[PDB]
Amino acid sequence: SITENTSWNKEFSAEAVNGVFVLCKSSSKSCATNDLARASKEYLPASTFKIPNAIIGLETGVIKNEHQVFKWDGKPRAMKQWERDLTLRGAIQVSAVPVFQQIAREVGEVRMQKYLKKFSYGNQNISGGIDKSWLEDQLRISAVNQVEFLESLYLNKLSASKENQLIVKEALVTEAAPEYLVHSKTGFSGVGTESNPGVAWWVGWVEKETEVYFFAFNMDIDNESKLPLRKSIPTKIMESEGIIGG
Amino acid sequence: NSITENTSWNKEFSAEAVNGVFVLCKSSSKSCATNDLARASKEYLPASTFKIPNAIIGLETGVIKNEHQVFKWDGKPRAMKQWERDLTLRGAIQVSAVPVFQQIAREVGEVRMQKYLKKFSYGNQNISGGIDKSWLEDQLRISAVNQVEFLESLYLNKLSASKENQLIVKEALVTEAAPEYLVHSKTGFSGVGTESNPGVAWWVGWVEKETEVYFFAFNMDIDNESKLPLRKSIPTKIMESEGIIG
Numbered sequence: 001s002i003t004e005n006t007s008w009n010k011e012f013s014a015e016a017v018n019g020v021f022v023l024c025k026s027s028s029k030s031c032a033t034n035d036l037a038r039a040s041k042e043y044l045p046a047s048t049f050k051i052p053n054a055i056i057g058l059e060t061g062v063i064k065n066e067h068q069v070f071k072w073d074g075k076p077r078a079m080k081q082w083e084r085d086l087t088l089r090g091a092i093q094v095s096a097v098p099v100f101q102q103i104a105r106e107v108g109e110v111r112m113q114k115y116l117k118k119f120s121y122g123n124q125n126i127s128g129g130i131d132k133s134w135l136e137d138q139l140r141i142s143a144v145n146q147v148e149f150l151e152s153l154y155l156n157k158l159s160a161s162k163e164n165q166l167i168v169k170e171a172l173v174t175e176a177a178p179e180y181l182v183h184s185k186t187g188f189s190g191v192g193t194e195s196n197p198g199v200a201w202w203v204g205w206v207e208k209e210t211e212v213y214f215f216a217f218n219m220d221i222d223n224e225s226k227l228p229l230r231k232s233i234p235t236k237i238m239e240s241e242g243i244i245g246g
Numbered sequence: 247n248s249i250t251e252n253t254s255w256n257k258e259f260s261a262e263a264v265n266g267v268f269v270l271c272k273s274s275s276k277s278c279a280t281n282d283l284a285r286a287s288k289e290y291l292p293a294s295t296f297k298i299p300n301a302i303i304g305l306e307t308g309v310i311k312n313e314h315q316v317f318k319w320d321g322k323p324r325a326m327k328q329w330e331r332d333l334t335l336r337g338a339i340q341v342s343a344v345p346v347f348q349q350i351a352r353e354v355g356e357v358r359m360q361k362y363l364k365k366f367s368y369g370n371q372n373i374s375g376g377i378d379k380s381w382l383e384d385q386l387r388i389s390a391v392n393q394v395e396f397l398e399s400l401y402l403n404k405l406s407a408s409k410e411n412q413l414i415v416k417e418a419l420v421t422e423a424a425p426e427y428l429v430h431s432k433t434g435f436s437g438v439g440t441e442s443n444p445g446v447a448w449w450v451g452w453v454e455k456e457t458e459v460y461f462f463a464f465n466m467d468i469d470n471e472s473k474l475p476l477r478k479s480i481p482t483k484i485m486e487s488e489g490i491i492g
Contacts (some may be wrong), residue, residue: 093425166413178340
């Protein structure tokens with residue numbers, strides 16, 4: 001069940017942002033959103049795609065184990081933060097596109113296609129994903145589908161070993177307090193054009209005391225200065241629902 | 247052989263008039279340093295650090311049904327108000343909820359508890375004390391070196407337990423999460439004891455900084471709870487002197 005809360009639009013209008021937030025307590029069967037239509041609309045996943053990419057890398061043995069170090073060969077990378085050796089967690093946390101492109105190359109299109117179908121991941125399209133593409137038809141996923149996928153991961157219910165799901169889960173931890181734990185992942189497809197904007201994401205789940213909340217946020221973005229809104233708008237809505245971190 | 251005594255590390259102990267030991271290892275237990283070789287191998291009551299093997303054994307035996315089990319508070323008074331609430335496995339470990347772990351140990355039983363402490367090479371492997379309060383001379387005790395060996399085995403998923411159960415307990419131990427800085431840790435305090443026979447306080451864990459891993463175990467004599475903060479500040483100062491900063 002999903003309830004539209006139009007009162008949640010105030011956080012978007014205050015920042016002059018077009019976007020959607022989906023928040024669910026306990027399971028994907030109890031959810032609220034500011035916009036029902038946009039909650040089901042599919043968008044480029046951008047770096048949020050590193051979550052299934054990492055599970056598939058481990059399932060296929062392309063990622064040898066939890067402790068594999070992805071060595072920097074010294075060749076130029078698009079972001080300075082990627083020009084270094086990275087663990088699987090580090091590569092996910094800094095959104096290291098080149099590490100995941102090499103994993104996707106080794107997995108191959110046949111196995112990547114097979115696993116996106118097994119995971120019910122978005123439109124399950126073979127194109128884009130970890131690669132930059134201007135194809136009209138490429139991988140896209142809705143905020144509702146992100147919550148469903150993340151709930152499956154949280155419950156170790158994806159078509160993958162529980163061990164591999166647990167490895168990716170610890171790699172996604174972004175805040176740890178005794179009774180407050182956040183797993184999350186950002187994405188940003190690029191500012192696009194003023195008429196054809198890019199998308200920014202923040203997806204994850206929060207374990208507060210004995211409760212769990214799943215969330216997925218996306219927004220249209222045509223100016224990179226607006227990128228921090230992908231965390232501040234959802235953080236404000238979650239604080240209004242009593243989900244408050246340190 | 248694998249451990250060097252660094253007398254310079256006594257600096258932070260002398261400044262606080264503390265009798266204690268710090269063991270720090272890089273990459274593995276084969277490259278370590280300590281301020282006191284003798285105390286590094288001396289066995290002390292594990293106190294709440296015993297919740298680490300207790301949790302693994304609880305999962306291995308099925309007493310802890312799964313990763314998502316909620317330990318319900320029966321409403322009966324507990325020794326600390328912070329324990330008078332429902333707790334997850336991570337919450338119970340993070341707040342050192344003794345009653346939750348005593349009930350787990352009761353269901354596991356002495357025979358199985360003993361069998362697993364032998365499998366894990368955990369301290370003197372004594373059947374007495376542990377999560378239960380005892381003043382027996384012959385009860386469970388463990389050295390800082392043995393804590394590092396045990397935590398290294400857990401980090402590597404090399405304990406005699408499923409890798410799934412080792413991964414569940416590892417996420418429950420995360421205490422700091424940054425993109426390229428992750429800390430797993432656990433405190434313990436046996437109680438103030440007496441001036442002639444003092445209590446022991448612990449801080450044990452490991453730090454993943456970029457692609458490096460450091461294992462650590464700290465213990466100190468404590469006859470006044472006002473000194474408890476030193477169990478974290480002394481090891482933090484030594485680790486910061488080695489560039490391990492969070």
